[PDB]
Design a protein around this ligand. Sequence first.
Ligand SMILES: CCCCCCCCCCCCCCCCCC(=O)OC[C@H](COP(=O)([O-])OCC[N+](C)(C)C)OC(=O)CCCCCCCCCCCCCCCCC
Ligand SMILES: CCCCCCCCCCCCCCCCCC(=O)OC[C@H](COP(=O)(O)OCCN)OC(=O)CCCCCCCCCCCCCCCCC
Lengths: 96, 99, 98, 83, 88, 293, 175, 171, 347
Amino acid sequence: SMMKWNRERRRLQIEDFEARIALMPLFQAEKDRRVLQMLRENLEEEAIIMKDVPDWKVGESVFHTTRWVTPMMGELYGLRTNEEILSATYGFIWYT
Amino acid sequence: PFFDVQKRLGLDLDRWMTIQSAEQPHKIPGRCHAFEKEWIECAHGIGGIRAEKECKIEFDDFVECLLRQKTMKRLSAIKRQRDKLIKEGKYTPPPHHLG
Amino acid sequence: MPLVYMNIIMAFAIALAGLLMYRSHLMSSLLCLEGMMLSLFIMSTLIILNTHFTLANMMPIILLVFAACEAALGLSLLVMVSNTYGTDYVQNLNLLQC
Amino acid sequence: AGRIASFLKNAWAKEPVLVASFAIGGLAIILPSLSPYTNYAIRINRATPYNYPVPLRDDGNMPDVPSHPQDPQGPSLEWLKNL
Amino acid sequence: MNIMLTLLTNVTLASLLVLIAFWLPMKFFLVAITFLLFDLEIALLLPLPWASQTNNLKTMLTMALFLLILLAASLAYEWTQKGLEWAE
Amino acid sequence: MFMINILSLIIPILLAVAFLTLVERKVLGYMQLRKGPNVVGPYGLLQPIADALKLVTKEPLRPGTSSISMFIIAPILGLSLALTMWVPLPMPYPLINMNLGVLFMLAMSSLAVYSILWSGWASNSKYALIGALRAVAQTISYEVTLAIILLSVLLMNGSYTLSTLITTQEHIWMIFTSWPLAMMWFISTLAETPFAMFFMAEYANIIMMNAFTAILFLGASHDPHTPELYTINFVLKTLALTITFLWIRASYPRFRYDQLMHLLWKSFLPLTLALCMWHISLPIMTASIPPQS
Amino acid sequence: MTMYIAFILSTIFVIGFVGFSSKPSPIYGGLGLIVSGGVGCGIVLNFGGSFLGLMVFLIYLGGMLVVFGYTTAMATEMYPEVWVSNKTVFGAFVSGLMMEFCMVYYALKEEEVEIIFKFNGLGDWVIYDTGDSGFFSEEAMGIAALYSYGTWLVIVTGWSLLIGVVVIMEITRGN
Amino acid sequence: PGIVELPTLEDLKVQEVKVSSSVLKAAAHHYGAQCDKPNKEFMLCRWEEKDPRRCLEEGKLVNQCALDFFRQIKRHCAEPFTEYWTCIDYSGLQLFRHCRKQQAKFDECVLDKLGWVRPDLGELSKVTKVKTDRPLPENPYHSRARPEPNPEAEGDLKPAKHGSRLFFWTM
Amino acid sequence: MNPIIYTTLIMTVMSGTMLVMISSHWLLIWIGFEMNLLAMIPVLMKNFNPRATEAATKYFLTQATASMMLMMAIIINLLYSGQWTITKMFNPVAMTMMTMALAMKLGLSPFHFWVPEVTQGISLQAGLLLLTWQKLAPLSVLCQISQSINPNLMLTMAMLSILIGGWGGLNQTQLRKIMAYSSIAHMGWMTAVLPYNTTMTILNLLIYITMTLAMFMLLIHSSATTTLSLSHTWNKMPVITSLMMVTLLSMGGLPPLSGFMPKWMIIQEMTKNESIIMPTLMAMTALLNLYFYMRLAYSSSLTMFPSTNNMKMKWQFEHTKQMKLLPTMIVLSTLVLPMTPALSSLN
Ligand SMILES: CCCCCCCCCCCCCCCCCC(=O)OC[C@H](COP(=O)([O-])OCC[N+](C)(C)C)OC(=O)CCCCCCCCCCCCCCCCC
Ligand SMILES: CCCCCCCCCCCCCCCCCC(=O)OC[C@H](COP(=O)(O)OCCN)OC(=O)CCCCCCCCCCCCCCCCC
């Protein structure tokens, strides 16, 4: 009885995974826009806050290579409500 | 290894885990996989003496990704001036920053 | 390198210093021993999880399961030195003067 | 014959526990490479898609891969359907 | 947020109950080591439920069986050479 | 309102801890031709109130050679533990659906040994020292059978997520696949389990152990719309187990220590290993490995 | 702010270590160590180390440290000592607090001290990534690979454990 | 050390799909079947280019076709959509198990109204080829120049000149 | 110990050491050291006398401390580079941290106080294992990381070890203490050349190894534990003292007796590195080892000593041990100076 039921669950799981696969690319585009939107907002704020500094021109590439480093969580949100950081950073870990 | 017995018989004893860009289970990537791939590929067949100086920016960028040191201080001085600027009312955060 | 990362590092240093000088008790000496591996287990755990080293998560549990072989042998030596001399006091370990 | 039958009788009389555990472990470690289902077990394990099936650049002569998830080309999961 | 909140209130009611309670009015060590050695072996064979869904399951079965065979050998050895029998 | 849900659990469990004692004495009573508490209130309904407020009015004498700090925090942990493992139970929908609930249950329930160990040490008496030593070795001996049984049980479940247990059982009670383990598990639960506290600490362990055994081996059907079906089934199953738990309390001479260790390490541990070996290959044997997700 | 979860658990970990590193009573040292072991789980759990964290609670807390309580109870020195018995214990306790006070206050003020390493560091919440683990728990898949990619680490780990059994009985045998 | 190029806010304006997760998952199976080419080519950009900034127009197309996929099911049997996803949303795991009749009340339109077929098990998981205009990236990792390998030893072995040459030891 | 138990115990000690020499992963290295410690203790605790318990406790505490101190150094390397290979470490703090941890397990620097005592309490036969086989694995790791070693720290470790090795041995009478102090002095000799050349370290390893079994197992055959007890050996076994004296002479390093070969090549290699004060000092204080070497040689074969009446009894009976590998160890440790160009074989 467990043999038959367990395989049924595996057929259920792959169907659930099939839904996730068929529906993943939209979030990839959505997460793509979100982080780039959040980065552009951060740089736009940077172009408003920091002028008096001697030489801290906006948008310096910390990494020498001209690749796209995945944005680390700090400078992603960074200048936001402390609730936003707490929900974004821990979030999933604390949601229980 | 002092005695590369695994090299002779050609069986993997501890090379599966020695670096983070190996055949990870279910292809879950390391955080600095892209930078490590460049550093390893730059420093191959070159030797420790030559590669330590030649492939330097690869190691430094990969170290920065691995440690998150220099760009973290970029953020540290971002908040440093911010607290030193908005406190005396020189500028106010825009609505999206407020939430 | 974040504040917490070296909060473990000093904890290891304090644990190392506690083991590096004995006050009067071998059990207390042993307590600093696996205390050092606790930070060692702890410190490794942040590194692997932070770096997404998907295959290195092996290392922490085997770091603990092998530090136990030290501990298990550890007290089992003390039980020997505390049944001939009776007391776990470490100043009674000077019988090897010559 | 005489020794073994007496020995199992010697074992199973005073103690049934160890002979039970030895037996249960005996089947549990022999039977793995007997049934034609461990091949089935690894096949459904490989079937379960966790990461995305990233597409390949089409440039001709790969009839194996399909151009649509509805196409007959590529792997068929129907073996598990009756499994 | 939620986890330690449940822990915090749990001990707090434990605290208030006890507070009003006291304000209103070689063998033993031997197996303890064997348990320790056994318990560390338990942790090694704990991740099995996820390991049952690997793609290299053929090498899993031999390896996962190897622990239980080897763990049982430690028990079998400990039993035979007096040892595990309750010492005096 | 999530805080209200905690009190909607801790207190009734605390009352549940309070109120099955009259069940115990009257079951144990009526078993031996006796009646049990029936003179204080109707059928002893008020007997628990008859003892509790008396206990809190009794002065808590403290031994002269007792470390007060340990003597008061050992019950603190004992009650804190006894009311903490009730939180991840998949009762309808658990308060906390920890993805590693089984591990959390084991780590925090194995922590109860500290309370009894500290109580014997803090009391500082010849009786208390051995009694703590006997109790702890009996306890620390029996997680290895506990852990293996639960580990080997969960191979056919899918993960350590306690909520997944309901989906696994659904069709049949999980005992029918591991009944050799059920007797293996149930017996081990018997032995693993200030003074006013110590009633509460071990006692919630008694019910929760049977609540834990209830979900593990004798599951129910959780209808997504109506949850009362699982509530009644869960309560009824954990009541039958607890009655059995006291059914055997007054039905056998109590174990002696040398047999107590001999029973596990020579007749329980080796058989537990074999069943674990049986239940690690059988999902592979029949290609019935379960889904974790 | 619950943002204090950043340092609160880590600094409690330090004072937990100073508790037993200062050599209190072996029972008390166990108390200090399990407390540090208890809060140490929080840092791992807040990082996603559910399985690794709970194992510390299992073998380190409910295992290793319990057998220490067994040995210490067996020793039962005729006069157990307390955290006040020796002023050196208190002297180290105040000392250990002072170094962590110096580090924390230096951390909170200048953020650029140079003890041993470069130090630096804001609240820890930064170092996390912005990726997702999909449907597979990254930790669980890591340790499940023990039987898949680590079929050599297991042999040496298992063999030593059995050898761990033989040595233990060999030196406690008593002849 | 270099401009961190970031597209402006104006280009970052899509007709964002305003639907919940449950409704997304309820129609996800038919979504993948009838709208594979937008998603298939977009994520090929995401994996070949390996740069979010390099893949924006394809990000426009996937959402646009999602809206184009979410319009007919409004026009034809919007009500059967409501009942299906209002029962899917109840499940805490979005369990497809306790949604069968409502699932049947969904796909029978698209079977005859829109001419769609519910994908079978392991169909959307099939790896597929894609015909895209996009050229193959010259170096997705932005690799710089490579160091010259040390020269390989050439010429056959010869006897050591004058033997050991270790102090007075001649041969 | 049941011989099957003891044989498997030795077997995993060798396996633990062998694993160290063949493991690229840093973690596997710590495992090999962990297994080596895990089974070294029971071998010391074979006689089961209080001195053995004292020695095992000292050995375990210092080795376990260095083992996890070693583990800390690896993590820092991981913390700063994310690597696990043994090629060249990437953090100066970790360089010193592991150099301290590795060195303590060899007992050369101030981290050497265990070595004289741990060999003293334990039996002679197990002493041979401690001072010969337990000294390859830490040396094996050090050779692998010799590129990144810090010369200033490492050579300070060498100077102190040779200085303490000679000075300590001058004042000891228990010949077990003599061997350990001589071993420490030899350890400083080999340990000085890792930054310059690992090959010369290896040659110093084999020559020092063969020499120790030659001296130790000859001491086993004579069945002596003190200088006075060694004195009587001339009456019973005059031959044993004859080779034992020539081994002591070689142990000092007097040509053409091999054993001068490592000291000679060590001086030559450092001289090529423009280090010339350093070779002179160690060479000059190497004579300190010779003094107690001659002193032991004096009262064993060179001058007969007052024997005992009961010694006549020992003459009648004969040794039962087959003294395996003893003869070829003496010759290989006393006459191989002309065969020095075999240095190329090690490279
Ligand atoms: C294809 C099949 C695969 C699987 C096959 C599995 C093997 C076949 C079945 C084996 C036997 C059944 C499983 C194991 C049972 C225990 C084995 C054992 O050691 O027994 C002897 C053991 C030990 O018996 P012993 O000590 O007299 O003898 C043992 C053997 N010697 C002498 C060598 C040591 O029995 C006990 O421990 C007695 C019970 C102790 C607890 C007291 C209370 C008992 C309450 C019983 C009633 C309630 C039951 C509740 C059950 C759960 C409900 C949810
Ligand atoms: C580098 C510089 C030199 C370094 C080494 C110096 C060695 C000598 C000094 C050592 C220091 C201590 C001082 C001397 C102490 C001697 C103590 C001793 O044991 O003396 C007595 C001993 C008794 O020997 P015994 O057992 O009687 O056997 C005799 C032979 N049957 O006597 C003996 O055991 C000696 C026995 C001698 C046996 C030698 C056999 C030689 C055989 C040669 C064969 C040649 C064949 C040639 C063939 C040519 C054609 C091919």
